[PDB]
RNA sequence: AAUUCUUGGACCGGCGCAAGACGGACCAGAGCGAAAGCAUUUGCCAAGAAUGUUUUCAUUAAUCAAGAACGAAAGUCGGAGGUUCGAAGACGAUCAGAUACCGUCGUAGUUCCGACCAUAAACGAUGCCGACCGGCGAUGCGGCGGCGUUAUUCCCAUGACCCGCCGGGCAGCUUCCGGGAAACCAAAGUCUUUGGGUUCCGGGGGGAGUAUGGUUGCAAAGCUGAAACUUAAAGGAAUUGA
């Protein structure tokens, strides 16, 4: 929610989200094989090129 | 398992750091040092341990740098001990610079913030002045002492566990000398413990004479020098 | 929104989910906050918020399920505000508002047992708040700045035990509880708070009516302590007159005279009573008993301090003043002790108290008993510095002392080779950082006391030690040497003869003391009578047993 | 194999869109429900057994002709829908024949809303309530006591394991409790040493759940339900053969 798409992919390249959830749910019931199974894309903003060429260096 | 090809630990460690999670980045490197991959020192084991001890400093976890080096000394036994020398010198080097920065930080920015702040004695500063002393020690304890109490605990652990006797280390005596000069920069009551440390480790040598260890006799290096 | 019928029946179903396992805990204060902010009418928002306002701040102490833990800076802050909105509405509307009839609603809480102790439910919030604050101080690194950042809230806590002190519509007789809670935040307060509003010379500096309303709170003890003495000695319970008077004694100390205080200690008879008392008061006794001799020391009485501060420092458990010490013996009971540990700022300093049992003895032992120590041993007091003098002398190496006891010795060892110069110069070397001058809350004067008891107690030395070939001596030049007043030297040089029965003669119209001592190789055959008595003093004891 | 589909580009790969079904693996001799039955997430609504209790009322209870609520699937009438599957159908095979099994299509139906229907190997082929009579180790829910491991680092206190105990529940293994024609059964035991209470219901096999009347239903059909006649057996468990 709080940061942009360049940084959410930087989180999905490890599995920082899955490791964070796994450590958080240790008190309720210890989970082990925790991942973000799938990411889907529903909506994109109207295409920009300057925003693409920042992502391409 | 965790890994095949132990160099991948560096890539996961580096990937986690770009997000800014040095606790699980350290967990990755910790899992590789203690596993099947105990092959007597791979060329990639140095950059792993260099990053490992950088993160151990940045988080301040002496008891992890203990276990890390304790594993390393084992996987770089008589194969090559230059690796131990380079690693542990670079560890204590990194910790010394964190304390250098920590003082200069607290002693130019925050020390000037301290006597920038209105000294004109309110009730809260006057009440504590039947037990307590100056504001600089009162807030230098908040931003410097956790770094010098780490430098001490870093030195003592590097001496005690790792280099008990073990003839092949002149580094042991280098550390001892460096940590005596460390006491001229900071606290003194962590120097009586240092003396007692040398006393018991010397007592530990000439009581047993029972391992591939220091023969304190005509041997000029490991007796005189 | 309607006829207080939809706010006495929504305040009777959100303080009903209180304590329950599905409490919420946090967003229950919000629904007690959204029955005052959507309460915007008279007797539906601007009359009877009081009954809600009791249970909006009572809802803030229940946020923490434990009673051993402390409110966070956020929670602690908002409950110092919500206790004051209580007092915004209970000051400028003089009446009772959890009952005591006026019109009909939304007051008149008679049907509820007593509309008097639900009314006395404000003193028990400011008493619960007084105790809640102490936990904020018990759980901070006391050598950190975060201690000072929290002690800035002590101007804000002392305010509300004063704002809800003046409020005299109690329902003297029954107010004494908030009196003790007030005096408890005044009893350990220092000189420059209690003095430097009396001591600013009362002229056109402080002689207007409300400029002399900062002059209320120096002796607030005079008024409120006797009220917690002779209403409470008439009334039922015990606790608030045992505690009340020791706060009085401790506050007639460290910025007032001994004679005023010591009388109160002996009036109440707590020397031989505080045995069946509870520990929470049994420490306040120890705190008082220690400050007694510390302030006796401050004025001059340097042997009255000694014989009072023996039974405290004698123990290895000298932490009956402070945060407790070492090894095991029932851990569950030692967790009933970390909730007793008194607050850091209040603590009598220990490197300051050990430096009054090696600085009082040093003037009652290394002076009183350097007379009979030349071959006349049957007066040796067997509890003194030799506790430690056998230690810091049985060391093969010493230099310029570093510790307290050697820095309380290396001027003592020259106080044998009197040297007024050398001994005065090593109780004021590097102690004004290490608690001698600063800590004893009298800035320079305790040294003016010490210096005098160094200047004087070093003229009473050549008298007792270095008199062998001294027959004709000087007592004008002796005043020039050591710089004391001629009468304050003409007194003790006179005392030297009668008080210490010395073999030296006097005609003090000339101010002189001819000696004619001869004892030197005559006390040797008397040093034979140190033992020729302990032959024929034994035949006195032999036939006591025989028959 | 053929019927069928396709150079008017089928099948295959890619990106989109729409529709109507269904809720994989996790999923178990696990749970809940009076039975039929019940599984993606979250919210709202009312209900419920079990445990806990030094609360309350004080015999208010058990089983039940009449009467009544729910009742898989198929079936019927009216409305919306029709992706998959698919009685009848239409062909293609197989075969001596094949009105079948195998294949390609395919209508009613399969799904939802509102009205009927009231039967199933609706099964534990085993009425409900109460008492007594062996052992053992698990399992689900609630409570209680207890070394220690672990997550909240700050551990009080909560969860996850670990070791027992108590009460209900789905089951399991074991035995000369005992019963039984046996198979098997902690009930199918406590039965010639025969009686705790109470409802339904069977009387050799066929004819026959047939005819006839009556009753419910739009219909299909449901519930109640014989006789003449016919016959020395039909049958249940277990053993040896083939």
UniProtKB/Swiss-Prot annotation, chain A:
Disulfide bonds: none annotated. Keywords: Acetylation, ADP-ribosylation, Cytoplasm, Differentiation, Isopeptide bond, Nucleus, Phosphoprotein, Ribonucleoprotein, Ribosomal protein, Ubl conjugation. GO terms for biological process: cell differentiation; translation. It is found in: Cytoplasm; Nucleus; Nucleus, Nucleolus. The keyword Repressor does not apply. One of its GO terms (cellular component) is nucleolus. One of its GO terms (molecular function) is structural constituent of ribosome. Component of the small ribosomal subunit. Mature ribosomes consist of a small (40S) and a large (60S) subunit. The 40S subunit contains about 33 different proteins and 1 molecule of RNA (18S). The 60S subunit contains about 49 different proteins and 3 molecules of RNA (28S, 5.8S and 5S). Identified in a IGF2BP1-dependent mRNP granule complex containing untranslated mRNAs. Binds with high affinity to IPO4. Interacts with DDIT3. Part of the small subunit (SSU) processome, composed of more than 70 proteins and the RNA chaperone small nucleolar RNA (snoRNA) U3. Component of the small ribosomal subunit. The ribosome is a large ribonucleoprotein complex responsible for the synthesis of proteins in the cell. Part of the small subunit (SSU) processome, first precursor of the small eukaryotic ribosomal subunit. During the assembly of the SSU processome in the nucleolus, many ribosome biogenesis factors, an RNA chaperone and ribosomal proteins associate with the nascent pre-rRNA and work in concert to generate RNA folding, modifications, rearrangements and cleavage as well as targeted degradation of pre-ribosomal RNA by the RNA exosome. Belongs to the eukaryotic ribosomal protein eS1 family. This is Small ribosomal subunit protein eS1. It comes from Oryctolagus cuniculus (Rabbit). The chain holds residues 177 to 233 of 264 of the full protein.
């Amino acid at each position: 929610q709080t940061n942009d798409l360049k940084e959410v992919v930087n989180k999905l390249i490890p599995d920082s989200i899955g490791k964070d959830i796994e450590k958080a749910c240790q008190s309720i019931y210890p989970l082990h094989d925790v991942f973000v199974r799938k990411v889907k894309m529903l909506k994109k903003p109207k295409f920009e090129l300057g925003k693409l060429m920042e992502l391409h260096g | 398992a965790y890994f095949q090809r132990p160099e991948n630990a560096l890539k996961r460690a580096n990937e986690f750091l770009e997000v800014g999670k040095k606790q699980p980045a350290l967990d990755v490197l910790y899992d590789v040092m203690k596993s099947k991959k105990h092959r007597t020192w791979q060329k990639i084991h140095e950059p792993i341990m260099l990053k490992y001890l950088e993160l151990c400093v940045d988080l301040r976890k002496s008891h992890l740098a203990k276990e890390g080096l304790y594993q390393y000394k084992n996987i770089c036994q008589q194969v090559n001990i230059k690796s131990l020398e380079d690693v542990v010198r670079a560890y204590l080097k990194l910790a010394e610079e964190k304390t250098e920065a920590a003082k200069e930080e607290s002693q130019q920015m925050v020390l000037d913030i301290e006597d920038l702040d209105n000294i004109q004695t309110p009730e809260s500063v006057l009440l504590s002045a039947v037990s307590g002393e100056d504001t600089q020690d009162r807030t230098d304890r908040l931003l410097l002492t956790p770094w010098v109490k780490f430098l001490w605990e870093s030195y003592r652990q590097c001496l005690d566990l790792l280099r008990n006797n073990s003839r092949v280390e002149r580094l042991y005596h280098d550390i001892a000398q460096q940590a005596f000069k460390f006491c001229l920069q900071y606290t003194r009551k962590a120097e009586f413990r240092k003396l007692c440390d040398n006393l018991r480790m010397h007592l530990s040598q000439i009581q047993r004479h029972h391992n591939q260890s220091t023969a304190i006799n005509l041997n000029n290096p490991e007796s005189q020098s | 929104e309607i006829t207080h019928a939809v706010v006495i029946k929504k305040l009777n179903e959100i303080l009903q989910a209180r304590g329950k396992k599905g409490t919420d805990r946090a967003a229950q204060i919000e629904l007690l906050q959204l029955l005052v902010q959507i309460a915007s009418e008279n007797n539906l928002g601007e009359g009877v918020i009081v009954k809600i306002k009791f249970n909006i701040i009572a809802s803030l102490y229940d946020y923490n399920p434990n009673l051993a833990t402390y409110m966070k800076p956020e929670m602690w802050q908002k409950c110092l505000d919500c206790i004051n909105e209580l007092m915004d509405i209970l000051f400028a509307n003089p009446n009772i508002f959890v009952g005591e009839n006026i019109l009909e609603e939304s007051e008149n809480l008679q049907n509820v047992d007593q509309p008097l102790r639900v009314r006395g439910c404000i003193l028990t919030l400011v008493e619960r708040m007084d105790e809640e604050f102490t936990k904020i101080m018990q759980n901070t690194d006391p050598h950190s700045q975060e201690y000072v950042e929290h002690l800035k809230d002590e101007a804000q806590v002392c305010a509300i035990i004063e704002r809800v002190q003046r409020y005299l519509e109690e329902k003297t007789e029954e107010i004494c509880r908030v009196y003790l809670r007030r005096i408890l935040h005044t009893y350990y307060k220092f000189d420059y708070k209690a003095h430097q509003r009396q001591l600013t010379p009362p002229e056109g500096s402080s002689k207007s009516e409300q400029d002399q309303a900062e002059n209320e709170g120096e002796d607030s003890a005079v008024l409120m302590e006797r009220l917690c003495k002779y209403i409470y000695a008439k009334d039922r319970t015990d606790r608030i007159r045992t505690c009340a008077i020791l706060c009085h004694i401790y506050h007639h100390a460290l910025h007032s005279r001994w004679y005023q205080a010591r009388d109160l200690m002996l009036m109440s008879h707590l020397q031989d009573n505080i045995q069946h008392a509870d520990p929470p008061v049994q420490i306040l006794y120890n705190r008082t008993m220690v400050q007694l001799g510390i302030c006796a020391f401050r004025q001059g009485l340097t042997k009255d301090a000694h014989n009072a501060l023996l039974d405290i420092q004698s123990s290895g458990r000298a932490k009956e003043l402070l945060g407790q010490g070492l090894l095991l013996r029932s851990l569950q009971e030692r967790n009933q002790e970390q909730e007793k540990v008194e607050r850091r700022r209040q603590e009598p300093f220990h490197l300051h108290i050990n430096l009054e049992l090696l600085e009082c003895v040093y003037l009652v032992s290394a002076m009183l008993l350097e007379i009979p120590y030349m071959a006349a041993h049957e007066s040796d007091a067997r509890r003194r510095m030799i506790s430690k003098q056998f230690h810091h002398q049985l060391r093969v190496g010493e230099r310029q002392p570093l510790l307290g006891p050697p820095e309380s010795m290396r001027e003592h060892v020259v106080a044998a080779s009197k040297a007024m110069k050398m001994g005065d110069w090593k109780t004021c070397h590097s102690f004004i950082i290490n608690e001698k001058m600063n800590g004893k809350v009298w800035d320079l004067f305790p040294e003016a006391d010490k210096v005098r008891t160094m200047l004087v107690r070093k003229i009473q030395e050549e008298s007792l030690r270095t008199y062998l070939f001294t027959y004709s001596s000087v007592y004008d030049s002796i005043s020039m040497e050591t710089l004391s007043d001629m009468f304050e030297l003409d007194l003790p040089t006179v005392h030297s003869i009668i008080s210490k029965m010395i073999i030296n003669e006097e005609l003090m119209a000339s101010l002189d003391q001819p000696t004619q001592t001869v004892v030197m190789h005559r006390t040797e055959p008397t040093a034979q009578q140190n033992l020729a008595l302990q032959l024929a003093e034994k035949l006195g004891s032999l036939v006591e047993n025989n028959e």
